[model samples]
Target: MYGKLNKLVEHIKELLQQLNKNWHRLQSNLHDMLQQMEQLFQEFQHFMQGNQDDGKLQNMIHEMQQFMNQLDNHLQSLSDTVHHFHNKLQELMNNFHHLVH
Candidate 1:
């Protein structure tokens, strides 16, 4: 029974390691995309600055900026949650190891 439990824990640790790696990849990709979007928005804003009769365009830009800000906030919270879970899992594995040893 102890051997079976140890194998299971090892499997869970491997899965967690894989998940952590994938999460980092996903986070980096999202950040890169967000950065690109902001850069594009800035360029567009600069291009539109010379037009005096584009209030509608300005309004849309403002809305997009707000949406992006919200997305950023959500991503931060999600990162925190994931980190918390990861830490919790690490602690669980450590405790299990102690029990098994």
Candidate 2:
């Protein structure tokens, strides 16, 4: 039983370590997504400016702002989700520890 539990803990640790190392990849992917969104914003801004449209420009800008706010909220929620997941892992590990001891 002790050997099996010890192996399980080690496996969990290794899996978590692997995930930690790959977190950089996850961050890079998110950065790429944000960069694409930024490029779109620039393109739209320039498009509106060059055309010199009247009320349409204000509407476009407002729409962009609202979209960005939504995107920001989505990212925040993703961050919060990961935080909760980490807490969950801690709880599971603690329970395992108690069970073994």
Candidate 3:
């Protein structure tokens, strides 16, 4: 029973390591996308300002600004949740180690 439990713990540890690596990659990609979007939004705003006639364009820009804010907030929450989960997994691993040793 102890042997099987140890094996399972080892498997979990390996999986967690893999997951951590992937999560970092995902976080990097998300940040990159956010930066790109911000740049594009700035350029779009400047282009709209140069023309400065259409109420429709102004409304669309306002909507895009709201969407960007939402995305930024959601991404922050997601980051917090992931960190919380990862820390919990580390605690679990530590408990398992204590049990085995």
Could you tell me the TM-score of candidate 3? 0.58
The number of the candidate with the highest TM-score is 1
Q: Mind giving the per-residue lDDT tens digits that candidate 2 earns over 1-101?
A: 99999999899999989988888887897799789878977887688768767767768778878978987898899899999999999999999899978
lDDT (Cα, tens digit) per residue for candidate 3, span 1-101: 99999999899999989989988998798789879888878877787868775876778778877987988798789889989999999998999899978
User: Which of the numbered candidates is closest to the native, going by highest lDDT?
Assistant: 3
Assess every candidate by TM-score.
0.59, 0.55, 0.58
For every candidate, C-alpha RMSD to the true structure in Å: 3.6, 4.8, 3.8
Where is model 3 more than 4 Å wrong at Cα?
Answer: 53-56, 59-63, 66-70, 86-101
lDDT of each: 0.86, 0.85, 0.86
In candidate 2, how many Å is residue 37 off? 2.5
Model 1 agreement with the true structure over 1-101: per-residue lDDT tens digits:
99999999899999989989989998898889889888977777677866644766777778888978988898899889989999999999999899978
Cand. 3 Cα-lDDT: 0.86
Query: Which of the predicted structures, 1 or 2, would earn the higher TM-score when compared with the native?
Result: 1
- Prediction 1 TM-score vs. true: 0.59
Residue 54 lDDT in candidate 1: 75
